[PDB]
Amino acid sequence: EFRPLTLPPKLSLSDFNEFIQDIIRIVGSENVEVISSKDQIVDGSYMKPTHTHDPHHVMDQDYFLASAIVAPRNVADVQSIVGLANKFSFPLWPISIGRNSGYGGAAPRVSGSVVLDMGKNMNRVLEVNVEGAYCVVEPGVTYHDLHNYLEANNLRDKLWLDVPDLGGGSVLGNAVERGVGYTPYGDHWMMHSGMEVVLANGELLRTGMGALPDPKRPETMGLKPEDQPWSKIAHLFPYGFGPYIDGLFSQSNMGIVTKIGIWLMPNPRGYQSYLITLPKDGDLKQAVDIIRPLRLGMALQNVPTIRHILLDAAVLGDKRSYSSRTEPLSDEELDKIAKQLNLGRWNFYGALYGPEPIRRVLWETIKDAFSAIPGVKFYFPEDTPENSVLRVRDKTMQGIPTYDELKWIDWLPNGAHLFFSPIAKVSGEDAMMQYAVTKKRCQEAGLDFIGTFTVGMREMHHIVCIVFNKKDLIQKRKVQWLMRTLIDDCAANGWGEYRTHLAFMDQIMETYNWNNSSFLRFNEVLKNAVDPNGIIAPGKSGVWPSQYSHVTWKL
Amino acid sequence: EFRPLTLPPKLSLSDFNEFIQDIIRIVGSENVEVISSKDQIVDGSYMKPTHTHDPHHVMDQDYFLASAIVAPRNVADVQSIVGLANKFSFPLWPISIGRNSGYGGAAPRVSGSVVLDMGKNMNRVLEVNVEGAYCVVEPGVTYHDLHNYLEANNLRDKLWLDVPDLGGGSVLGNAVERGVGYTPYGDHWMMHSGMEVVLANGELLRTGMGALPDPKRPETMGLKPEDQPWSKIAHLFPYGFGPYIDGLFSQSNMGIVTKIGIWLMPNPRGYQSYLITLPKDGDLKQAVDIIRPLRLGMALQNVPTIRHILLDAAVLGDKRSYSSRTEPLSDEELDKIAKQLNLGRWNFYGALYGPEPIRRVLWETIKDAFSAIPGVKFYFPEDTPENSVLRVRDKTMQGIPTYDELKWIDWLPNGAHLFFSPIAKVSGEDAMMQYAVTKKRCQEAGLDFIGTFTVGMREMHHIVCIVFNKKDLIQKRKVQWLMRTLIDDCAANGWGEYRTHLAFMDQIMETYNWNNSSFLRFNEVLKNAVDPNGIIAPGKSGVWPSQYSHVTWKL
Amino acid sequence: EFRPLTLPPKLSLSDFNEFIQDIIRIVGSENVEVISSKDQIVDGSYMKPTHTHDPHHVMDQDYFLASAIVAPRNVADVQSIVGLANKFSFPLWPISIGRNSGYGGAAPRVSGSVVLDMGKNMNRVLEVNVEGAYCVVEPGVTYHDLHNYLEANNLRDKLWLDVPDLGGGSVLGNAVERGVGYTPYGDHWMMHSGMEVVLANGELLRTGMGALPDPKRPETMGLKPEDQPWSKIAHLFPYGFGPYIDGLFSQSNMGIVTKIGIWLMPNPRGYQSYLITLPKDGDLKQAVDIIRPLRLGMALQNVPTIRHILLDAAVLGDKRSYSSRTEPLSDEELDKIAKQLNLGRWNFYGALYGPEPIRRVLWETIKDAFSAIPGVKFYFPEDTPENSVLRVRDKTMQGIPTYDELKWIDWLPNGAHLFFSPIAKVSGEDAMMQYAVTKKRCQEAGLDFIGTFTVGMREMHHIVCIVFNKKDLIQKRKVQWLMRTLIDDCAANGWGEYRTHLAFMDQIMETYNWNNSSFLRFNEVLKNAVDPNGIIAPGKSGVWPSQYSHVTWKL
Numbered sequence A, B, C: 001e002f003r004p005l006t007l008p009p010k011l012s013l014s015d016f017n018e019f020i021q022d023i024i025r026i027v028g029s030e031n032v033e034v035i036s037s038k039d040q041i042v043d044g045s046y047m048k049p050t051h052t053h054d055p056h057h058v059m060d061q062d063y064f065l066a067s068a069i070v071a072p073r074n075v076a077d078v079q080s081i082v083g084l085a086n087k088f089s090f091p092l093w094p095i096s097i098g099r100n101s102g103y104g105g106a107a108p109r110v111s112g113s114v115v116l117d118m119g120k121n122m123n124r125v126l127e128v129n130v131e132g133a134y135c136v137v138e139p140g141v142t143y144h145d146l147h148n149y150l151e152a153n154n155l156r157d158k159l160w161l162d163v164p165d166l167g168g169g170s171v172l173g174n175a176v177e178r179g180v181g182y183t184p185y186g187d188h189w190m191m192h193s194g195m196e197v198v199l200a201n202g203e204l205l206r207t208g209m210g211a212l213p214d215p216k217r218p219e220t221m222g223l224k225p226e227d228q229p230w231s232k233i234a235h236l237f238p239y240g241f242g243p244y245i246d247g248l249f250s251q252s253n254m255g256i257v258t259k260i261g262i263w264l265m266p267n268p269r270g271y272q273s274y275l276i277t278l279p280k281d282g283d284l285k286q287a288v289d290i291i292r293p294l295r296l297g298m299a300l301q302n303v304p305t306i307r308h309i310l311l312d313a314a315v316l317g318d319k320r321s322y323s324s325r326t327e328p329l330s331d332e333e334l335d336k337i338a339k340q341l342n343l344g345r346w347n348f349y350g351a352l353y354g355p356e357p358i359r360r361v362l363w364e365t366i367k368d369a370f371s372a373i374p375g376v377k378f379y380f381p382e383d384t385p386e387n388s389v390l391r392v393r394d395k396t397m398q399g400i401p402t403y404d405e406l407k408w409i410d411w412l413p414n415g416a417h418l419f420f421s422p423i424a425k426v427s428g429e430d431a432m433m434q435y436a437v438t439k440k441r442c443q444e445a446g447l448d449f450i451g452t453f454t455v456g457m458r459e460m461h462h463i464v465c466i467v468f469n470k471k472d473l474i475q476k477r478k479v480q481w482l483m484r485t486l487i488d489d490c491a492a493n494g495w496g497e498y499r500t501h502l503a504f505m506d507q508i509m510e511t512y513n514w515n516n517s518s519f520l521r522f523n524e525v526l527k528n529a530v531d532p533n534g535i536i537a538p539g540k541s542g543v544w545p546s547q548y549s550h551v552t553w554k555l
């Protein structure tokens, strides 16, 4: 409790101690973990994450690190700490889950900060409404939970989730992060309606229609604002009236979110998952010119994703279990692998939704569509092996949370994922053009290119999956080089990343430099006005309170 | 030029004069119209709007009024004036079109303000890209234009708009206002990607991916930031990286928008409009419980709208041309009218989109769906008269801009529309429950209830259409009473309005009072930080720069 | 001493401790009670009140609560603490008595505050002057005391008090609260002349003529300002010269009052109390049209009060001792009760004052007046039973303090009074019109309407007496609902409450919203200027120092 390994800025030890003390004096000694010595070395697991730092560590492991961690027990709690963080100018690092792995996990941008483990005690499914087809959750509600909640309330037969590759993340955190999932409810952020947050001054706020208060009633009298129910329309319409501010709340540091309204997808009455294996590495090109109008025409239902063989392969076994060769794999061993598995070089998964008479037609147009690609082959989970990736993806394209993809995090003995994610047009050319670049460097990096193009409706997210050995300093540096390098090129070409690890937020935000950082600047102004003190997650999205030296702080 | 009828606050005449002078000294005498005497009495037309005030005037006609008007010729212009408005603390009232009729039109919230007729000279279709299925426009681009643009470039066969009941409004303004249209691209605001605005400090900003700058090239050298092209992804992905600020830009006074990226809907390959007449006033109830899961299942394509007989009737002829009776019409004369027209009490229009094999099925489920409603009857524009509303709605549900609905603005000799628009759940009950309230007051008001429920996907917008005689002070007051009254009740019931005339922004913003105006307050803080001086449209969405007395200002 | 259960805002534990320490270091350990654990559960009694909170608790019992309590021993003391409250920004909650029960008692608006038990040691009758017919008192002087003081100085034969229903309250506190009593000296606040208060800066002030200092004299040399006598005219004329500021001192948080000049009523030379029972519930109507011109003509002497049967009945026995029926009593059981007691539905008490030749005439006009009401019946305490309410009221209408009315606080097993008190015109219509509303809700509330119209000379105070069970959370919520509900309606009708419990000060102050809170705003400005720090009773009368989030604070 007395002497963490790292103080936040300008902070005195006594102050830390007092601050930390009052905090124990509220959330309970149970709710706080002070980080006193390096024996923190304990990185974690995906099963039970470390909140102190970056598990997959690229910089010094100990580089981005908490001074201590706090489990607020309830909103009022969050409110009080904000007060203290304000009294002492101790800044906070709020997190729901811990899982922002491949992005930094629980590690705070600024070291010596306070990690606000929000999900610990705030695990509630506040509500699930069928007629509205939505749910309301706390940070702590992981996807699996949100799911089991449905199962145990026999709702599955009426409403469905939308999960990301992994089952464990916070439904809530992922949404503010603007994460991605598979069904037609894939765009997480967009699926929200009505949120709540403890702004910096410690004041509570609820968005959109969340502002229009539920009328009064004998049963609702005297409940803290926090515990008050919401208005009817709160979660069925996100806008409200006048300035639509929710966005200041995603991937920013404008506030601490306590709750959120997530739309649920009504069981559609028909579902069919599949694969369309692509034979040549260059097929990736025509496939896109293909996938393009189908998605826009909505012939393409959920989010199409087109996987690189190894992703699947890695999902399948370690790199070693395929070729004990320190260098990266030859254009040739892939094909060999591509065949060993019955996959392509490129591997397109999707799903059809609803009444079969329409699923049937759609498939015709698609199946019929991808036919111009030679050696193309179509499948249904049944037409494939038991360890089959497509197997998992079927649960996936239907809200069922897996955990199997993690295994690809295993390719290299010390696995640590990291993802580069320039966004590119749905153009086979551009897709190809992008890729070339990406791969080339992975090469240069001593790296196996590994990645996928998830298809947005009018844009495409290229996720370069960089595993790397968390213990080989030589490689990690190679990775940092690679990273920052790719960032530069991408932008050189006009492609921005849309999400990133802690260590690159800056470089990333700077790419977005039109008219002289005009945007960053605007932002700063707003962060200032609202977080006069910088307590809330300074450095996020590379945004810094004036209290922070851009000089001492950026990277 | 010398002596407008109204000065903005704390402004001296000399100052006005100097301010106004320098302004002529840039935009040209052509670009400015000084409002010197009441002979402004000239209200307008929909064909060529008055910018000085509120055409359909509820308060004193002259109540909300410009001191003068200015047509910025180009962005730099807008930038300079901002400077002047800042030099003199003269505030501005930016408008694209002029058409915000039923909301106030060109009338500025604060009188003596400067009306910034943005659309006058900034009429450009900057771009339309087919592969992206989007366009980029200036305030001045009205819908008809955006349309004729397609026609004259033979694009109609590939891309389609999404219009509101009327053809003339600014595509751009309507979007920031969060307006509504008919096709599946009905949600205007949501269809935007990449915008540009002159913030208050006069600095330019482009959102999302608009921040990621187009790489350099010999042909783009030396163009003002304003004239620079955009990045590839600029208009195909709205988010960018870090804080998603676009929303601060809709229905707010955070900035002056110069341009915007609007998604275009690719010609779908099949379209079928229709009507399903509802016989009993109470049918409105079951219809909704009906429409509800179809929209969520997406069986329901574009935005369903369920019209009250009179809307159609009024679209059809004046109230007099149906019953010279100063009082409002009897539950009975309607039915009589409902029959005279072949319509119902309630009248549901929609459209099917794409390949007939799917249109066909959909219609079955729908046609098949509404069958539980007795006396229900289905139609295609062909199955109806030539003056038929459905005729117009077919052009409408397909991006073709009409002008015919205006005629309903004619019901009462001096027609002036005004709309009340509580938002309610897609629940027949609630729908009914809402309505009751609404109508009851229209009664009390000496008013014909006239309205419609446009169906949002998970919420429903009830548009009460209040015509009223712009010259009968007795009635107008009745209307104000009605208004403010309805506002109170609605909220009493938990329904917020989402858009409103100038004269009620306040009352409206106040309904949104959860946790003590927590939201309004937050907003104010942001407006402050960014418009330290209050020049930009103070009072909008009922948000006021501290420079403004809430005491002297609210209503 | 070390760890109260609640800190005031932004306060650190060490600070509390230091603050609390210095305070012990002056007023004595005897004078302070630190609130360390929930074992505070001890609500109290009317005989010896709890200062920590709200005895009759509507919100969480523990909702509004002290951090500790302090008994300043003398003014200098009050002055020093003010200093400390200022040094630490610890705010204060000053109280004389503790009895503000049905309003909150000793509970501070803001929890974690310091309760300033002023009356503990400042119990003095500083003076009673016969020729002036006034007295001067400290907070601690309860009414009984002020009375016994007269008895033991044989003054009763020359001067008389004016008590409220209860004997125990602070004569002083009740006056600043603008309380009410029975004789012609019923308007407490108005009976004051010359007061003294420790303003926020810790500086002492004496009002009106209190400012004109008593000339110097050998015997008065060197006495603290506090102990200095007053000028002659100090207590016989309230105004002084220039701005009449006393009012900033009643029901506000502009200062801590240490003393006050209260006018005494000279024994009048004749007194006769009585009752005029009203038979029908609707008699209440004509009675008022009756009582109206008599009061204005002054035929009506003291404050007439017209009681609802149950008040008397409850004064008489518990509800159970009349009808074991969880629901509220039938219009019928009342009449039955009304008869069981010899009372009416409505029950008008009063008194005649002075020389019999005039009392005699008055009574004629009155007796003669109420004769138009059928079944009307007149009485003198003698014409009634021993447990008779009128018995008590005779002592009452003559300054003699009872304690018997408390028993009505007993109707329901866990008794807790609360009072709603819209003010209405002296119009039988309005009176009736008001009542209807009030009762209707009590209904809805599962509540027995219980109340009375005390007649002001040109306005009438309707005191709805809500008992309710302090342990039944279901009911309490019902009460809050009821409350806030009634508040809304009343105002809907144009009736304001004039006094209220802690938990509604806000809702109440907001009703008073003419011209946009113009008044509240003005007030705030003044509180600001004078209590730059907010230490003095923030939130009172719903007025909050800018140091206080209206967002975090209101209700």
Ligand SMILES: *Cc1cc2c(cc1C)[n+](Cc1ccc(O)cc1)c1c(=O)[nH]c(=O)nc-1n2C[C@H](O)[C@H](O)[C@H](O)COP(=O)([O-])OP(=O)(O)OC[C@H]1O[C@@H](n2cnc3c(N)ncnc32)[C@H](O)[C@@H]1O
Pocket: A094, A095, A096, A097, A098, A099, A100, A101, A102, A105, A106, A118, A139, A163, A164, A165, A166, A168, A169, A170, A171, A172, A173, A174, A176, A177, A178, A179, A180, A181, A255, A256, A257, A258, A405, A406, A409, A417, A419, A421, A463, A499, A540
């Ligand atoms: C390891 C991994 C990650 C991954 C994968 C697959 C694997 C094997 N899939 C594949 C993928 C990856 C990236 C992209 O772009 C697409 C696909 C994912 C997937 O399919 N879709 C995704 O969107 N992400 C995937 N990820 C990444 C990762 O698994 C997810 O992003 C997790 O959901 C993140 O973890 P979680 O524990 O939910 O978040 P947490 O550690 O709590 O941090 C959230 C961040 O947001 C802010 N924040 C969080 N909570 C709050 C609160 N309460 N208030 C305010 N802000 C909050 C913080 O800044 C925090 O840093």
Ligand SMILES: *Cc1cc2c(cc1C)[n+](Cc1ccc(O)cc1)c1c(=O)[nH]c(=O)nc-1n2C[C@H](O)[C@H](O)[C@H](O)COP(=O)([O-])OP(=O)(O)OC[C@H]1O[C@@H](n2cnc3c(N)ncnc32)[C@H](O)[C@@H]1O
Pocket: B094, B095, B096, B097, B098, B099, B100, B101, B102, B105, B106, B118, B139, B163, B164, B165, B166, B168, B169, B170, B171, B172, B173, B174, B176, B177, B178, B179, B180, B181, B255, B256, B257, B258, B405, B406, B409, B417, B419, B421, B463, B499, B540
């Ligand atoms: C008369 C009428 C109106 C109408 C109708 C039908 C009729 C007969 N239909 C039916 C309807 C009405 C309301 C609702 O809610 C639904 C349906 C409409 C329709 O089908 N859908 C609509 O969304 N609106 C309809 N309306 C209302 C009206 O016709 C439209 O809202 C117009 O599009 C508004 O006029 P326009 O000329 O485009 O706007 P303008 O006068 O320029 O003002 C825009 C406001 O927004 C801000 N703003 C505008 N330009 C800028 C710029 N450049 N920068 C910054 N802010 C800007 C301003 O605050 C301005 O006040």
Ligand SMILES: *Cc1cc2c(cc1C)[n+](Cc1ccc(O)cc1)c1c(=O)[nH]c(=O)nc-1n2C[C@H](O)[C@H](O)[C@H](O)COP(=O)([O-])OP(=O)(O)OC[C@H]1O[C@@H](n2cnc3c(N)ncnc32)[C@H](O)[C@@H]1O
Pocket: C094, C095, C096, C097, C098, C099, C100, C101, C102, C105, C106, C118, C139, C163, C164, C165, C166, C168, C169, C170, C171, C172, C173, C174, C176, C177, C178, C179, C180, C181, C255, C256, C257, C258, C405, C406, C409, C417, C419, C421, C463, C499, C540
């Ligand atoms: C329980 C009850 C209450 C009651 C009753 C009858 C019963 C059974 N009678 C009937 C009645 C009730 C309400 C109304 O409107 C009319 C009639 C009362 C009566 O006949 N007349 C009344 O005026 N009130 C009656 N009340 C209510 C209650 O009994 C009285 O209001 C008491 O006199 C209040 O208690 P007391 O102990 O005197 O006050 P205290 O707890 O010290 O608080 C006073 C408040 O004023 C401010 N304040 C107090 N002291 C100071 C000092 N020294 N400086 C500055 N401000 C001070 C504080 O804000 C404090 O909260």
